[PDB]
Design a protein around this ligand. Structure first.
Ligand SMILES: Nc1ccn([C@H]2C[C@H](O)[C@@H](COP(=O)(O)OP(=O)(O)OP(=O)(O)O)O2)c(=O)n1
Ligand SMILES: [Mg+2]
Ligand SMILES: [Mg+2]
Ligand SMILES: [Mg+2]
Length: 540
DNA sequence: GACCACGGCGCG
DNA sequence: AAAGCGCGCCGTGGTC
């Protein structure tokens, strides 16, 4: 019911837009509208009308900004009601839900989206009047970060497509050998990808023991953890786990990624979703480039396909022991602080215990394993689970958990203060005041309450680490531009950059310093930096 | 074609 | 699977 006005809109109007599909790098811009001052302006031809905007201001601003960047236009994102709602409550993840919560409807019409953006901005900006810590997060982190993310998304990353095509052919041959061996040991063929058929074979036909059951339907589970258990109670299991590895990698990375190269960039473009997680982390999708393989030799082969443009180098920067350092700061544990002031490495230390070798003997595959144990235990893994992953007696696992925490005695104190203030206020918060609402801290079913507790005390540590990385991205991005380097990926506590070969060294030193200095804590932040033609060689 | 739930699993 | 947390994507199996 807004007065139809002629295009263009006045400066500072709210934009609405419709995409043929959710990925801005692939979408056709179907319709473009703007709203301000009781007027809605609808664009005659959406692509041309992009040239008239000075900024993208409205719901999903970053997506329109990426599509503008793809078309050679600098149209930075500004205000986005989604960002306001997400700071108020990170359960606010989609326009559909935000619109109904704060007074409107997310439709499929640009003009209605424009009007909705204007109202939703007014209401939410008012709900934020007075929330000085959240306002600071919005102005100094989330709103400027969206500009960085738009540039990352539009830049993309070079992928060695030919290499991966070749790899698909080798991997397929190994899958068919493993499959043939599985069928032989079972005495007939069947779909190894059907967990239902595999369950029957393993537990009915071959009589193997069934260790555990699935959550929703109570089937006998065929998970890696259950199969690792009985990995000698039959050799078929050995093969199935290998088949699972290869097919996971082929179907998720090797085959799909080469078909996602963009015609106009020649590169691979992810999306960095800014209002997607309960803790303040980013997520990555279409495709997810935050879960590229790294653990196994085949995974590393896949990771080697992510390469630098000709004449450039990749620079990979990864915070050291990051959530332990954050925990040191948040809890104030004297022993934990000392650890890092002394340059100790808890992942290496735990790996030493796990595999029984001196710390100078811990290799990379060993240290990485220690990480799940270290964060497993910190965030509340059960002795039974630990016992089974480490392959030690139950009593040895309880003992490790007890020693872990008694090493750093103020941590349990910090957990209980976090939970207690979380029961009273209904949310928990990061160092910078980012909040997560956690009801159920007072639930009357113990299992439900204890799950809420593990959610609640993880969020301040994981979310503070997320705040620190976002703030560093915001500080680092202008310096990279001035140096002619590019930011490509964020993987929670890691940045991957692309830099001209002749500046790569200065870029690495500079990026390390900004990341280490982003916000001084009671413990040094240390960053490991590597340079290489490919993502794997850049982390060594 | 489009959904979706589930078990499962890659990374942080 | 189990008292780690946070994600997104796969294939299967099922429905419309
Ligand atoms: N299994 C894991 C792995 C990671 N993380 C969290 C805590 C880590 O600190 C953070 C970053 O992951 P990294 O793999 O980079 O681990 P670290 O930063 O702690 O160790 P490293 O010194 O190897 O970088 O993500 C987690 O909760 N559980
Ligand atoms: Mg790290
Ligand atoms: Mg990392
Ligand atoms: Mg699921």
């Amino acid at each position: 019911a807004l007065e139809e006005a002629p295009w263009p809109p006045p400066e500072g109007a709210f934009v609405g837009f419709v995409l043929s599909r959710k990925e801005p790098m692939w979408a056709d811009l179907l319709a473009l509208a703007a709203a301000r001052g009781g007027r809605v302006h609808r664009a005659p031809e959406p692509y041309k009308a992009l040239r008239d905007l000075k900024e993208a201001r409205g719901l999903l601003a970053k997506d329109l900004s990426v599509l503008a960047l793809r078309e050679g236009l600098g149209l930075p994102p500004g205000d986005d009601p989604m960002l306001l709602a997400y700071l108020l409550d990170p359960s606010n993840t989609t326009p559909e839900g935000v619109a109904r919560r704060y007074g409107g409807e997310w439709t499929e019409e640009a003009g209605e989206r424009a009007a909705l953006s204007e109202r939703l901005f007014a209401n939410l900006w008012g709900r934020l009047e007075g929330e000085e810590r959240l306002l600071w997060l919005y102005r100094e982190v989330e709103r400027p970060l969206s500009a960085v993310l738009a540039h990352m998304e539009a830049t993309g990353v070079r992928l060695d497509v030919a290499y991966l095509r070749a790899l698909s052919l080798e991997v397929a041959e190994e899958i068919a050998r493993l499959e043939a061996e599985v069928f032989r040991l079972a005495g007939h063929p069947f779909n190894l990808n059907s967990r239902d058929q595999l369950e029957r074979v393993l537990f009915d036909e071959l009589g193997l023991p069934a260790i555990g059951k699935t959550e929703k339907t109570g089937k006998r589970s065929t998970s890696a953890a259950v199969l690792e258990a009985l990995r000698e109670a039959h050799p078929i299991v050995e093969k199935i786990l290998q088949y699972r590895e290869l097919t996971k990698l082929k179907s998720t990375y090797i085959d799909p990624l080469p078909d996602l190269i963009h015609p106009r960039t020649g590169r691979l473009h992810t999306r960095f979703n800014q209002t997607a997680t309960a803790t303040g982390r980013l997520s990555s999708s279409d495709p997810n480039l935050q879960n590229i393989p790294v653990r196994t030799p085949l995974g590393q082969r896949i990771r080697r396909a992510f390469i630098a443009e000709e004449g450039w180098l990749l620079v990979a920067l990864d915070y050291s022991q990051i959530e332990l350092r954050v925990l040191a700061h948040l809890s104030g544990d004297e022993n934990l602080i000392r650890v890092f002031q002394e340059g100790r490495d808890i992942h290496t230390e735990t790996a030493s215990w796990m595999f029984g070798v001196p710390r100078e003997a811990v290799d990379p595959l060993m240290r990485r394993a220690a990480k799940t144990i270290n964060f497993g235990v910190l965030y509340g893994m059960s002795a039974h689970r630990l016992s089974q992953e480490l392959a030690i007696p139950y009593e040895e696992a309880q003992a490790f958990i007890e020693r872990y925490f008694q090493s750093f005695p103020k941590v349990r104190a910090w957990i209980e203060k976090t939970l207690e203030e979380g029961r009273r206020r209904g949310y928990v918060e990061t160092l910078f005041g980012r909040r997560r609402y956690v009801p159920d801290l007072e639930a009357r079913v113990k299992s439900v309450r204890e799950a809420a507790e593990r959610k609640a005390f993880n969020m301040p540590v994981q979310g503070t680490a997320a705040d620190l990385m976002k703030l560093a991205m915001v500080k680092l991005f202008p310096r990279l531009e001035e140096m002619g380097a590019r930011m490509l990926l964020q993987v929670h506590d890691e940045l991957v950059l692309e830099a001209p070969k002749e500046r790569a060294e200065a870029v690495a030193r500079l990026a390390k310093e900004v990341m280490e200095g982003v916000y001084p804590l009671a413990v040094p932040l240390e960053v490991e930096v590597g340079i290489g033609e490919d993502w794997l060689s850049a982390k060594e």
